[PDB]
Amino acid sequence: LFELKELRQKFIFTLLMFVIYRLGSHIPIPGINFALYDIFSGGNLGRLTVFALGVMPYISASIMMQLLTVAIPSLQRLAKEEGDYGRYKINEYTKYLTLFVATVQSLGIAFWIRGQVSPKGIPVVENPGISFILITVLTLVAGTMFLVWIADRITEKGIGNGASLIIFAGIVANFPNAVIQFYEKVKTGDIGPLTLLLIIALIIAIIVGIVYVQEAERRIPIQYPGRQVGRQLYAGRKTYLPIKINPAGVIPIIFAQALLLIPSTLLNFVQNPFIKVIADMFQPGAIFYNFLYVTFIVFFTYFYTAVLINPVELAENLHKAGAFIPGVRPGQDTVKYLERIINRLIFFGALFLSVIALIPILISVWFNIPFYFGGTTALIVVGVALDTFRQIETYLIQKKYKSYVR
Amino acid sequence: KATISVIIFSLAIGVYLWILDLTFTKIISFILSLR
Amino acid sequence: LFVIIAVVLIISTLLQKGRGDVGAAFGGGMGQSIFGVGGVETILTKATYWLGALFLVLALLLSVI
Amino acid sequence: NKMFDPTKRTLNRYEKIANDIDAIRGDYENLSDDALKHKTIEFKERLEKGATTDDLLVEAFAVVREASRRVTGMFPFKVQLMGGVALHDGNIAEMKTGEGKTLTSTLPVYLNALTGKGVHVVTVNEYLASRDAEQMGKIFEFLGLTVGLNLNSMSKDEKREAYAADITYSTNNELGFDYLRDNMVLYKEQMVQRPLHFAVIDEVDSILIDEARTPLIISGQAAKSTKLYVQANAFVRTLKAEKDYTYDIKTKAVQLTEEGMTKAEKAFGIDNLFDVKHVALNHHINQALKAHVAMQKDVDYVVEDGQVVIVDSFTGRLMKGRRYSEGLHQAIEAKEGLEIQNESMTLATITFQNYFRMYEKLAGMTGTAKTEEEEFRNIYNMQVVTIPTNRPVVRDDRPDLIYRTMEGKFKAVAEDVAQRYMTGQPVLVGTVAVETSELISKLLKNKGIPHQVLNAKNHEREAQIIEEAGQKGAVTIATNMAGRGTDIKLGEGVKELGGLAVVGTERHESRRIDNQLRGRSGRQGDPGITQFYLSMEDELMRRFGAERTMAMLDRFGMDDSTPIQSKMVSRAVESSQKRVEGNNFDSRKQLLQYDDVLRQQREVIYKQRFEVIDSENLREIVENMIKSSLERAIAAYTPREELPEEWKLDGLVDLINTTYLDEGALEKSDIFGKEPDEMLELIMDRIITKYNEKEEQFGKEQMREFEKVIVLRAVDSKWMDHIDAMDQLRQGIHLRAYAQTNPLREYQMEGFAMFEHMIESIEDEVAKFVMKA
């Protein structure tokens, strides 16, 4: 039928993943289960953790390399060796790096949580056994391993981020099932499911941004390590042209969004947490803070991400940009040509992503809902979803040509 | 466009989450409940 | 008790696990890289993987009655 | 259980196998003459197949080693015996000196070949193809076989008999070209390689190093040729007009700043904004600029009055007429004097994984390094069997004595060679290139010292020199191209002090290679001496890792004399060596990975060409697809923009462009609307089949052949043509690194879309062509 079974792998990773995860959350010792905002969220520092330490070290790992390489490009001899040589070395560094960071988060979350959190079965006999401190450090470090080990394997079949999407699948799954989404509203919150249709509208919008603001140039060289390189004037007939430009990466909004959550978090749970109603730092400050998301994720990422260096390698290996009118001037001047496109397109991107969080915000004018749960989770769920589409896209279509049909 | 089918797929993929989610809750609870 | 030595083991299993990934790195890691071909077989290290998953659930039973 | 445990585990495995076989050798010594000949007939009859008769290997190898004893000599060592065994397995035994190599290869070569398939023996260079080919030869006639080696222009006999023959000796570069030779071939009688599976690699450390693909490109019909001649003349001179600050380093790419832009306006092309749709002119300037700079004409030397600009580069040793690129060959010609017309492409392949992995296994000899095993996994899937023969590493090797600021160090090395000469020590040097080598000898001349230079000056020289280099007090200088893998032997008494001497001009692009040039002293298991002289100014470091070396030294200390290597000098450089090697690895991956997806596209393409050559009446199929493709074209209509729509003017119009031929068939005929595919297909198909046979009238014999030339040339043409486009696609990968992920994603997409487009196109053209006469 539609499935056109072939992929031996597809169901395999899927089923396998489900088994590992169920146990992972229920896990004894931790299993703290949760983000929403403050009350719904949770955590000692401010990390929504479905489970004790794993997604956190992931974000940590990513961020560790990200900012470090960013502000300081080359601390020690590895910007990029040749891309691969530079990359593998880089990844190995990332593995150990994130690993240790996870440990730090381990003890801290352990201490705060065990001591004073909403209903927790956790018994206390002295530091019962090896301390929830040393013992939880055990589950936290060891825990880091079972998830990490799982993630890597997941990386084999599903993905490095397949594991993440599953997290989304679960959370995102939890609410539509109607676990607890029938409550506050003006005698509503159960009618107006048009909201479901409308969210659908949201899905179509998402696909639009990621096609990439796309566009590119020309020329191909190849240098084998050695004395020489080659060149070619012309020949061949075919379609297909070069495409360089891009759109914002996977969860940028979430990265910036979290920054906002930091000041807001303090405000919801200060010592003797004052839910300042007068200054509600759940929602009220939100407009200002949300703009903060825009500046940090969009602008700063785009600068480094855009890799200021680009005109060099390009202009260097003889290139004249191609896009929206025949390109021309090389050199730095071209970075100019590109610079305009990158920040410009990013403004466009801001319009959509910001529109996401904004979207429940726009609608909630007439009858607001205390059940915000959704939105961001979608941006992520779809994100990995489209990503998996990538896996199928390449994987799919075998040799069509010697089909049975001539 | 491709997107229309992507949405149909999106529903399909979601079906998996609902379905897989059921398994997790089922098996996971199994360990706690039985033992 | 069983658990007491086991806890010493639990940290231990953590260490072997940590190393496996670094060595595990030739193919890649965080994010992605390239689908190296030639493939992978079940690594000899996989025993550590099997031991881990078995181990955590074991803890679940042990952690409680 | 991955560790020494595996290598060691290997030891007993062989130690056991060897004991058994060793017994076989013992009883056998009763001079089995004719009886042995019967053995050759008995064994030959024995396998007759890939069955991998192991038992035979024991009795057969024994006959081999003994066969050698009868033949000549070179048969008493182990790492070789064991060598053939692991070899049969597909790994790498050995390390050099004594060991085997000569005899080693012969052993597994004998058993496998018996299949009657013919076996491949990867050898680095043609001079070598002759080497092992003859050295081992006696056991062959003994064993009653037909050896067979290939060479750049020829093997004295022909290609057909050569491969089909028993043993197939040759150089990879050639083996690739032969394999490819298998494309345009209008016929199939051409024995051009009988299928290619198995191969043992002599000096495997190279079988990997061959990064850049193996492309065979002959046919270049340049429309532009007259223009290029005059035009290029002007072009190169223009760049000459410009000065040094062009900035060209670390890569083959080049462009220039202010003077550059200014120059561009300075010469024809007042237009400041040159880029818009007029890069082509710029293309000419960059061409010469790169040519005059990137590869010294002296790399690309011209033989005495040969006037043929020949490229010796890439670890070669003078390859007659050819060029890596479309722009360069002509560019340098503009520099020299006789200018050529050609610039052509055809086909390309990964020498190793695409080729070897395309079919069967490999087992190399020598290099034991750590660096190769990962490679041996990713592409090949082989391992390493490290084994020292009698008295390991009997030779001594001294450190990389360093010297600063300029090649002046080589000057000091000169006096060094002299002192050796006085002591009566036969020396040899492995220089970097042609120019430096020559200058090197010139120095010896200033000093007045005898010597032979085989820096690819003349091939014949390589011959004389082989027995010649190292004949008591002798002095030889040669390029690394001559510098790797040779069974050299010192005359008598020569070894009296030190034994052999080797001095290197610097440290090559890879760690192994540096070692290789060194390894060139030590056969049968004797002593020798090696030493390297490097300069902070030489090459490896001049461009690579220069940035760091400066601080490391300048902060460390400027003042001193010539010799130094106290504080991390040799240490640091070594790190850079791996570093540079690393770059190779990275570039290795890019073309390797892409070419992999190419391996599949390519397979369908010529494999299809094979089917066409073999079968006679494609007729029903070709028309059918031509129609189904054409009709579906008229067919594409569905709800959408609808490419066609079988209606009236809509189809009539698009279909007309779809069927634009001087021929006439119902073109004008409108008003219709019997779309069930039966109707549309029958009408066009009839005009074809009918006209086909009507056309067929010309001749049974002659006509059959037409699809030959047409199908292959036309099909072949389109693909090679779209292959050039394939080059451009590689540019797209250049792009992938930024934006999306990096798995060769964008490339894969495009590879297919390009190719479905490619074939449909084929049916169109190949079809219409069948008509004209």
Curated annotation (Swiss-Prot), chain A:
Keywords noted in UniProt: Cell inner membrane, Cell membrane, Membrane, Protein transport, Translocation, Transmembrane, Transmembrane helix, Transport
Gene3D superfamilies linked: SecY subunit domain
GO process annotations (BP): protein transport by the Sec complex; SRP-dependent cotranslational protein targeting to membrane, translocation
GO CC list: cell envelope Sec protein transport complex; plasma membrane
Major site of localization recorded for this protein: membrane
InterPro entries: SecY, SecY/SEC61-alpha, SecY_CS, SecY_dom_sf
Intramembrane segments: 43-50, 51-55, 56-76
GO molecular function: protein transmembrane transporter activity; signal sequence binding
Subcellular location: Cell inner membrane
Stored SUPFAM superfamilies: Preprotein translocase SecY subunit (SSF103491)
Stated role: The central subunit of the protein translocation channel SecYEG. Consists of two halves formed by TMs 1-5 and 6-10. These two domains form a lateral gate at the front which open onto the bilayer between TMs 2 and 7, and are clamped together by SecE at the back. The channel is closed by both a pore ring composed of hydrophobic SecY resides and a short helix (helix 2A) on the extracellular side of the membrane which forms a plug. The plug probably moves laterally to allow the channel to open. The ring and the pore may move independently.
HAMAP family xrefs: SecY
Subunit structure of this chain's protein: Component of the Sec protein translocase complex. Heterotrimer consisting of SecY, SecE and SecG subunits. The heterotrimers can form oligomers, although 1 heterotrimer is thought to be able to translocate proteins. Interacts with the ribosome. Interacts with SecDF, and other proteins may be involved. Interacts with SecA.
Family under the similarity heading: Belongs to the SecY/SEC61-alpha family.
Name used for this protein in its record: Protein translocase subunit SecY
Curated annotation (Swiss-Prot), chain C:
Any GO BP: protein secretion
An example molecular function term from Gene Ontology annotations: protein-transporting ATPase activity
Membrane topology qualifier: Multi-pass membrane protein
Keywords, ordered alphabetically: Cell membrane, Membrane, Protein transport, Translocation, Transmembrane, Transmembrane helix, Transport
Gene Ontology terms: cellular component: plasma membrane
Cytoplasmic membrane side: 26-41
Chain ranges passing through the membrane: 1-25, 42-63
Domain of life where this protein originates: Bacteria
Subcellular locations according to the entry: Cell membrane
Signal peptide: none
UniProt key word Metal-binding: no
Role summary: Subunit of the protein translocation channel SecYEG.
Assembly with partners or alone: Component of the Sec protein translocase complex. Heterotrimer consisting of SecY, SecE and SecG subunits. The heterotrimers can form oligomers, although 1 heterotrimer is thought to be able to translocate proteins. Interacts with SecDF, and other proteins may be involved. The channel interacts with SecA via subunit SecY.
Family: Belongs to the SecG family.
Protein name: Protein-export membrane protein SecG
Organism of this sequence: Aquifex aeolicus (strain VF5)
Full-protein positions shown: 8 to 72 of 100
UniProtKB/Swiss-Prot annotation, chain D:
Residues reported to bind ATP: M74, F75, Q80, G98, E99, G100, K101, T102, D487
Organism: Bacillus subtilis (strain 168)
CDD domains the record matches: DEXDc_SecA, SF2_C_secA
Subcellular location: Cell membrane; Cytoplasm; Membrane raft
Keywords tagged on the record: ATP-binding, Cell membrane, Cytoplasm, Membrane, Metal-binding, Nucleotide-binding, Protein transport, Translocase, Translocation, Transport, Zinc
Keyword Ligase: no
Protein name: Protein translocase subunit SecA
Function per UniProt: Part of the Sec protein translocase complex. Interacts with the SecYEG preprotein conducting channel. Has a central role in coupling the hydrolysis of ATP to the transfer of proteins into and across the cell membrane, serving as an ATP-driven molecular motor driving the stepwise translocation of polypeptide chains across the membrane.
Known catalytic reactions: ATP + H2O + cellular proteinSide 1 = ADP + phosphate + cellular proteinSide 2
Signal sequence region: none
BP GO terms, sorted: intracellular protein transmembrane transport; protein import; protein targeting; protein transport by the Sec complex
Subunit structure, as described in the record: Part of the essential Sec protein translocation apparatus which comprises SecA, SecYEG and auxiliary proteins SecDF. Other proteins may be involved. Monomer and many different homodimers can be isolated, some of which are not formed in the presence of a synthetic signal peptide. A single SecA monomer interacts with SecY in the channel. Only shows some colocalization with FloA or FloT membrane assemblies.
InterPro entries: Helicase_ATP-bd (IPR014001), Helicase_C-like (IPR001650), P-loop_NTPase (IPR027417), SEC_C_motif (IPR004027), SecA (IPR000185), SecA_CS (IPR020937), SecA_DEAD (IPR011115), SecA_motor_DEAD (IPR014018)
Pfam family, any one: SecA_SW
Effect on the protein upon substituting N583C: Forms position 588-588 dimers upon oxidation in vitro (homodimers)
Organism placement in taxonomy: Bacteria, Bacillati, Bacillota, Bacilli, Bacillales
Topology term for the membrane: Peripheral membrane protein
Cofactor list: Zn(2+)
HAMAP family according to UniProt: SecA (MF_01382)
Cofactor note: May bind 1 zinc ion per subunit.
